Structure formats: structure tokens, C-alpha cells
């Protein structure tokens, strides 16, 4: 019968202990006048910090504000790939708190995870991984909210499980991985390369072939039923890369994508 639970009144289940580690790597990056964007985690100790594209997309000045007091560190976009809701931004500091391994291999459904934003004030909303897919997502039941979002789901160890993406009780966070994976190719190439091609009219398909019949099956060998599941998988194919399966048959040398 029953369980668990702290007995006495000595302290009580604070997971505070666990979550004020990567609370603190968790940046507002803009409590009256509030206008903030949403958030953004620290990633690098030396300076780079991960965010949603959306939580910076048209903002013509990005003040962060840091854990360790009021201190608007001015930051510049290390890069803004919006297909995967990503974007990085430095900061002039400090050996910042970092982020962590959350492999988003390793996280499954029921992980305590922590959605830890600052929307200022560090605010962090509990709830377990949701659902894990790929289009590769955690949604989590940790209030995943514009406040929150951009700033870090964590683990009960503290790791970043995800980036918090607002959208729209079922809340998406971008898995530790295809955050590391990106931010870490946002530090290095500009943006996240990814390259070009139900159809439409551009280049690429044009400048190196000529859809005909509007709907391509396959992409390069791997069927695709399903609208923009090419939009995924013609981006993974980085741009400058050759591609297959016309839809009857035929292959494309693509290029870079755009600023959405």
C-alpha cells in the first residue's frame, strides 16, 4: 500500500538541487516591460547560446539577459535555421554554465524532464517526456510556453533534453541532439545547410532537370507518401548533394536553401 514521498518536515521534493544547475545556463534574451522574446540556454561555457528561430525572427535587437543579475549582454545571431527551429546567439562573457549531454537517443517517455525558461527571473515547468518522434520532437507535458520556450528541457540530472519550442497541455521541446547537431553546424557554417529542389516553380529541379507529373514518389530511392516528408527529406540532403526518384524517374544536383 501507497508509496513514497519525503516523510519528514526537515525538506521536501524540491527538485531545485537538480534543476538550479541548468537554471542558471537557462538566458532570458529580450516585471514590467516585458518585452522579451522567450529564451535561450547557454550552451557554450565561452559564449554561443541555443534558442528557437522564432524566439529571435524579426527582432532588429537581441539584449540577453543572464542568471548572475540584471545584465543585458548584447547579442548577434550566430545563425537562424528555421526548418528546425534553431538559432544561436554569442554573447561578450564570461566561462558561461553550459548546457549538457541530454543524448535525445537516451531520453524516452516518462523521463522527468524540466522546461526551464526565462521569460525576465528563471522559470522552470515540470512534466515528463510525452512523446518522442523521428519532424524529431519531444513533446513533453512540462508547460511548454513562448516564456519557456527556447530555453532548456532537462533531465532529472539536469542535461538538456530539449530546446523548448512554443507553437500554436502538450508541449514540444527539439531534442538535445538535433539541437547539438544543429547549434554546433550554426557555430560552424552560417546557417544549417540543407539544400533546395504536389510541386512548385523554382531553380534546382529546373536549373538541373524538369519535374514532370507534380508528384515525386521516391527521393533518391526512399518513397515519400506523405505532403512535406520530402521537405524533410530533400533538406537532409545537403545542398550541392544529387538527388533521385522523379515520379517514371529522374536526378537533380540541388543547392542552398533560403531565408525563410
Do not use: C
Not at 512534466?127 to 518522434?133: C, E, M, P, Q
Request: proline share 3%.
Amino acid at each position: 500500500e501507497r508509496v513514497s514521498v519525503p516523510s519528514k518536515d526537515d525538506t521536501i521534493y524540491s527538485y531545485h538541487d537538480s534543476i538550479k544547475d541548468s537554471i542558471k545556463a537557462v538566458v532570458n534574451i529580450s516585471e514590467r516591460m516585458e518585452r522579451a522574446l522567450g529564451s535561450g540556454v547557454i550552451i557554450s561555457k565561452d559564449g554561443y547560446i541555443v534558442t528557437n528561430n522564432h524566439v529571435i525572427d524579426g527582432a532588429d535587437k537581441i539584449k540577453v539577459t543572464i542568471p548572475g543579475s540584471n545584465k543585458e549582454y548584447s547579442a548577434t545571431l550566430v545563425g537562424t535555421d528555421s526548418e528546425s527551429d534553431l538559432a544561436v546567439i554569442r554573447i561578450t562573457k564570461d566561462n558561461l554554465p553550459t548546457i549538457k549531454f541530454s543524448d535525445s537517443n537516451d531520453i524516452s517517455v516518462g523521463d522527468l524532464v524540466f522546461a526551464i525558461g526565462n521569460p525576465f527571473g528563471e522559470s522552470v515547468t515540470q512534466g515528463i517526456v510525452s512523446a518522442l518522434n523521428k519532424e524529431n520532437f519531444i513533446q513533453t507535458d512540462a508547460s511548454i510556453n513562448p516564456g519557456n520556450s527556447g530555453g532548456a528541457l532537462i533531465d532529472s540530472r539536469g542535461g538538456l533534453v530539449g530546446i523548448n519550442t512554443a507553437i500554436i497541455g502538450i508541449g514540444f521541446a527539439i531534442p538535445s541532439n538535433m539541437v547539438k547537431d544543429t547549434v554546433t553546424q550554426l557555430i560552424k557554417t552560417g546557417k544549417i545547410e540543407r539544400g533546395y529542389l504536389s510541386v512548385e516553380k523554382d531553380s534546382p529541379a529546373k536549373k538541373a532537370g524538369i519535374l514532370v507529373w507534380d508528384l515525386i514518389t521516391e527521393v533518391n530511392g526512399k518513397k515519400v507518401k506523405n505532403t512535406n516528408e520530402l521537405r524533410n527529406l530533400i533538406g537532409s540532403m545537403l545542398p550541392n548533394q544529387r538527388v533521385t526518384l522523379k515520379v517514371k524517374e529522374r536526378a537533380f544536383t540541388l543547392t542552398l536553401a533560403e531565408r525563410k
